[PDB]
Each structure stands twice: as C-alpha cells, then as structure tokens.
Write a protein that binds this ligand. Structure first.
Ligand SMILES: Cc1cc2nc3c(=O)[nH]c(=O)nc-3n(C[C@H](O)[C@H](O)[C@H](O)COP(=O)(O)OP(=O)(O)OC[C@H]3O[C@@H](n4cnc5c(N)ncnc54)[C@H](O)[C@@H]3O)c2cc1C
Ligand SMILES: NC(=O)c1ccc[n+]([C@@H]2O[C@H](COP(=O)([O-])OP(=O)(O)OC[C@H]3O[C@@H](n4cnc5c(N)ncnc54)[C@H](OP(=O)(O)O)[C@@H]3O)[C@@H](O)[C@H]2O)c1
Ligand SMILES: O=C1CCCCCO1
Length: 511
C-alpha cells in the first residue's frame, strides 16, 4: 500500500512519454502500469500477419528527442509491428523507464479521495497506490469485439481474434475463414491468402481502399529524411493530419474531368490512404460532388481489378467515402485467386457455427479449420467505462458519461480532478503520435504549474466541457463524416491547447 506523486495507466506511445515527462522534467515520483507483460501498448498486442502502419515510417514515432530521430532506422516506407514494438522498447530502455512500470498488471479501480485530495489506485496484484495525479494513456481502443455467433463453441477448430494472435502460430495449408474487412481485415487477408489452402472472407461492409505503396528504402533515402527532420516535424505539427504531405486546398470540382483523374491516379500510384483523401483535393470530406468523384475513381479501380463480376460486386464499396480511408498491399487482387471465396453476409448472413465450419442462411457449410475474427474493438469509452473509476463525491465514470463520452480538450472531464486522458474522447484525428506528444506535453506543463503554484486540484467546468462538445459537433457536421473526435486538425488543436494554457487555464476550476 504505497504512495506517490503520479500514476500513469498504460505503456504504449502515450504512457511511455508521460512517465518520461513527469519523472524527468517535473521531478515527480511516477509509477506506470500495464496488463501487457511489456511496453508497446497497441503494438504489444496486435501481432497478426501483415500488421502495418498507415502512417509513413519516418513519422510514426516520437519527435521530441533529436538524437533518437538520427539513430533509429526502418526497412520499408511503412513500419511493421515488430519494428514499432522494437522501437518502443529501445525508447523505453533509452530513457531509463522499465523501472517505473509494473507490467503484467491491471489497474482495476481509481477512487478519488475527497478529503486526502488523492487518487486511490489498485492493481490486480493487490497493491494500492495513492497519487495526486493520474494520467490515463489507455488508448482509443478498448475490449476486443467478438460477436457471439450461434454454436460458436461447437467449433472444433481454432478461433482467433486479430488482437490476440498467438505468437508463432501458422495457418499455412489450413482452411481459414476471416470475419471483418476493416484495416486489420484487409491486411490479414492479403497476408493469409497466398499461404492457406482456402480462404473464405465474410464481408459485411466492403470499404474503400487505395494501394499503400509500401516500398523498400536504402540508408541514403533515410539520410535525406534525417537531414531535413526539423522541417518535417515543423510541417507536420502545422498541418491538419500530420501524415507528412502537404494538404491540398484545391477544390475537386474546381478542375477538369481529366485533371481530376490525373491527380487521382498519381495519388493512387504513389499510394497512401490519407494522401488520397487529403493530399489530392481539399474538399473531399466536405463537398458532396468532390466525394463522389473520389469514390467513383476507387470503384473503377475495383471493377478493373476483380475479374469475376459476381465477386466484384460483393466487394464494391458503396456510398459516401466518409469512413477513415484504408490502404492495402493488393487486397482487391486476392479475390482473383481460385482458393479465395467472398461471402456477402448482408445478403447471406451467418446462421450458425458448427463443428466443422460456418453455415450461412443459404444452407452451405463453409468448411473451416480456423476462424479469424478481424472484428476490432468497442471504442474509447470502453477502456474507462470498464472500471471502478469514481470521481468527486464517489461519482462513477459510467454515471458521469450518462450518454456519449465527453471531455474538455480531449484530455479532461468534469468531476474528475487531477485526472487526465491521453486520447480521451473529442480529441484530434491525426497521425496519433504527434497528437500524443501535444497532449502529454500539455498535461506535463499543467502538472508542473500545479506543483509550482500550490494547486490542490484542477478540473474543467461542465460549462466548458459542453462548449467543447459543441465545437467538436459543429465541426463534425460540417464534413461528410456526420452523414467522437475534434476534426479541426493538429495545428488548430495545438493553438487551442496553447491558448488555454497562456490564458490561465480557461474553462478550469483551479483550487
Ligand atoms: C493494427 C493497428 C495499426 C495502427 N496503425 C496506426 C497508424 O498507422 N497511425 C496511427 O496514427 N495510429 C494507428 N493505430 C492506432 C494506434 O493505437 C495509435 O497510433 C497508438 O498506438 C496509440 O498509443 P497509446 O499509447 O495512446 O495507446 P495504446 O497503444 O492503445 O496503449 C494503451 C495501453 O493501455 C493498457 N490498459 C488499458 N486499460 C488498462 C488498465 N486498466 N490497466 C493496465 N493497462 C491498461 C492496455 O493494455 C494498452 O497496452 C493503429 C492501431 C492498430 C491496432
Ligand atoms: N492504419 C492501420 O494500418 C491500421 C491497421 C489496423 C487497425 N487500425 C485501426 O484500429 C481500429 C480497428 O481496426 P480493425 O480493422 O481491427 O476494426 P474495424 O475498423 O472496427 O473493422 C471492423 C470490421 O469487422 C466487421 N464486423 C464487425 N462486427 C461484425 C459482425 N458481428 N459480423 C460481421 N462483421 C463484423 C466490420 O463490418 P462493418 O464495418 O459493416 O460493421 C468491419 O469490416 C481502426 O479504427 C483502425 O483505424 C489501423
Ligand atoms: O490511421 C489512423 C488509425 C487510427 C485512427 C486515428 C489515427 O490514424
């Protein structure tokens, strides 16, 4: 039953930096915690085949330490999970942090003590920590999502969730079904297709995907990037999404059918999902006609790629190109293989799982040895809403988030003092690490200020939280995503966080 200045929940990008900042800049005694048996967070857990970043390799990392940027290396233009995981372990060892982290250790309640003005925090190892500050780096993701299919437990084969992939497991020569065609699904599908005896993909909503263009690089290309890194990060910190391309301000309809498609083809060829949505035109997300053009281009690629038309149509993405854009390493092409079958489960849904496989409503048994669920997770809400987290006067987090989850500035919420969030709700939608730094940096300032000036407790007003929900909402419904995040872009997000701090923490009850 110990007592410290600060607790950090989680050891991915966000939890790792927060420890570094709170211990080494602000001198605070600081303990880190993670269920996981080591660091990496998202990348400790997802070791499924083909797991790859959407963010180019040079930019999906910390920026804050200039020696590190010069010494780290990568193989391709996008970075794989082993390589990311490895990088976070180098980072963890480089800044001397293993020793602040209790691994294999779940934080299971967070009681705020109104009279001691402290947070009482308990582990599944029995321990208790009493801390003045809590920093939640629990991520945008929550519990694995895992639809309970009828008869599932009759299945005599192995079932695997993408995020619980057994290290070392091979599906080579097995008959495998995959459910889900999200970002994970496309990846695990491209990578499985060539090795398995047969692949059945259960598609519910086919999505829009552009080539990822993941190319090999030589040490000289890296060294041209290394030489220009102050400008790269300054540029990225001053863009909206920080994916490393200039963001277009050219309206789609402001140029010609041929020009429009010329631009859409160079982007296709160059590769990159965000690059397609935002590197090409500036209104794809905000003008109806801009959007339809982008979407149409992609469907023509799909009909150019899938030879058999009954298959093509099952994989044909429909309607607004207003989900997060995917990119792949040859996804549509997989459906030309004789040992891949597509099952459109809107038209022909799963009726049940039986001993030997999956049965659809048409009454065909799809014989499977392995059923892989690429069905994702259950939202930000989920990693908080699954705990004894209570704020002032014992108020429960799930009681406090009576409806949609909320925050002020993506890092805080009313009735939860000295309690912060890294990637809480209504935060930025960007290449995450640069946003994680913004958040951790602001959180570490705020906490340095609190100690230096003798602040007992800080928390936002419910007035302010609601003003933020409105700002996020007004900006959302100006885009085609409407038809959970602040969508004004990193640069605006940074000026806002900075103004609030320069303005004496406006929207915050300081005690
Ligand atoms: C396959 C995949 C690819 C991705 N690619 C990209 C990309 O290219 N670009 C991008 O910007 N984003 C990407 N993301 C999103 C990605 O999660 C973020 O970029 C980033 O990893 C977030 O890191 P984090 O430290 O904030 O949270 P996480 O890495 O999610 O770490 C959170 C940790 O909190 C822990 N935790 C939660 N509750 C508790 C508790 N009660 N006790 C102890 N521990 C707890 C979890 O175990 C977890 O390890 C991807 C995600 C996935 C799954
Ligand atoms: N950038 C990257 O390289 C990368 C890679 C992987 C993951 N990620 C991130 O991590 C998050 C998770 O991605 P993800 O692909 O694991 O999950 P996801 O985006 O949530 O994809 C979910 C998939 O499962 C399907 N699905 C869900 N429940 C189902 C059910 N009961 N029956 C049939 N199908 C079902 C969905 O279909 P519907 O859509 O019709 O519901 C969808 O195809 C994403 O937000 C993504 O940004 C990023
Ligand atoms: O591409 C991504 C994946 C996670 C969602 C926001 C970050 O950007």
């Amino acid at each position: 039953t110990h007592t410290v200045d600060a607790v950090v929940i989680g050891a991915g990008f966000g939890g790792i930096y927060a420890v570094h900042k709170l211990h080494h800049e602000l001198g605070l005694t600081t303990v880190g915690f993670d269920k996981a048996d080591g660091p990496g967070g998202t990348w400790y857990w997802n070791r499924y085949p083909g797991a790859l970043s959407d963010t180019e390799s040079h930019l999906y990392r910390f920026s804050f330490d200039r020696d590190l940027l010069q010494e780290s290396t990568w193989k391709t233009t996008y970075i794989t999970q082993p390589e990311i995981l490895e990088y976070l372990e180098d980072v963890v060892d480089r800044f001397d942090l293993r020793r602040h982290f209790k691994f294999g250790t779940e934080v299971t309640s967070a009681l705020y003590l109104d009279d001691e003005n402290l947070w009482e925090v308990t582990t599944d190892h029995g321990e208790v920590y009493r801390a003045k500050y809590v920093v939640n780096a629990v991520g945008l993701l929550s519990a694995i999502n895992f639809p309970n299919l009828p008869g599932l437990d009759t299945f005599e084969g192995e079932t695997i969730h993408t995020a619980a992939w057994p290290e070392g497991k091979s599906l080579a020569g097995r008959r495998v079904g995959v459910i889900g065609t999200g970002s994970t699904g496309q990846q695990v599908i491209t990578s499985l297709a060539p090795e398995v005896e047969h692949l059945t993909v259960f598609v519910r909503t086919p999505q829009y995907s552009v080539p990822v263009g993941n190319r090999p690089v030589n040490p000289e290309q890296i060294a041209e990037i290394k030489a220009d890194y102050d400008r790269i990060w300054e540029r990225a910190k001053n863009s909206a999404v920080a994916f490393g391309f200039e963001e277009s301000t050219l309206p789609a309809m402001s140029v010609s059918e041929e020009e429009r498609n010329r631009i859409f083809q160079e982007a296709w060829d160059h590769g990159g999902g965000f690059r397609f949505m935002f590197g090409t035109f500036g209104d794809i997300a905000t003008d109806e006609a801009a959007n339809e053009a982008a979407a149409s281009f992609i469907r023509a690629k799909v009909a150019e790629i899938i030879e058999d038309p009954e298959t093509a149509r099952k994989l044909m993405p429909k309607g607004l190109f207003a989900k997060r854009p995917l990119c792949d390493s040859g996804y549509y092409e997989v459906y030309n293989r004789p040992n891949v079958e597509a099952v459109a489960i809107k038209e022909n849904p799963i009726r049940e799982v039986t001993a030997k496989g999956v049965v659809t409503e048409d009454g065909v048994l799809h014989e499977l040895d392995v059923l892989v669920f690429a069905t994702g997770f259950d939202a930000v809400d989920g990693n908080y809403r699954r705990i004894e987290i209570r704020g002032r006067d014992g108020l429960h987090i799930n009681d406090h988030w009576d409806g949609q989850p909320t925050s002020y500035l993506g890092v805080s919420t009313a009735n939860f003092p000295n309690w912060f969030m890294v990637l809480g709700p209504n935060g930025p939608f960007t290449n995450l690490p640069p946003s994680i730094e913004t958040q951790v940096e602001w959180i570490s300032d705020t906490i340095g200020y609190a100690e230096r000036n003798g602040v007992r407790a800080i928390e936002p007003t419910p007035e302010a939280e609601a003003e933020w929900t409105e700002t996020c909402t007004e900006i959302a419904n100006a885009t085609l995503f409407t038809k959970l995040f602040y969508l004004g872009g990193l640069r605006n997000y940074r000026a806002v966080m900075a103004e609030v701090a320069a303005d004496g923490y406006r929207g915050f009850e300081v005690k």
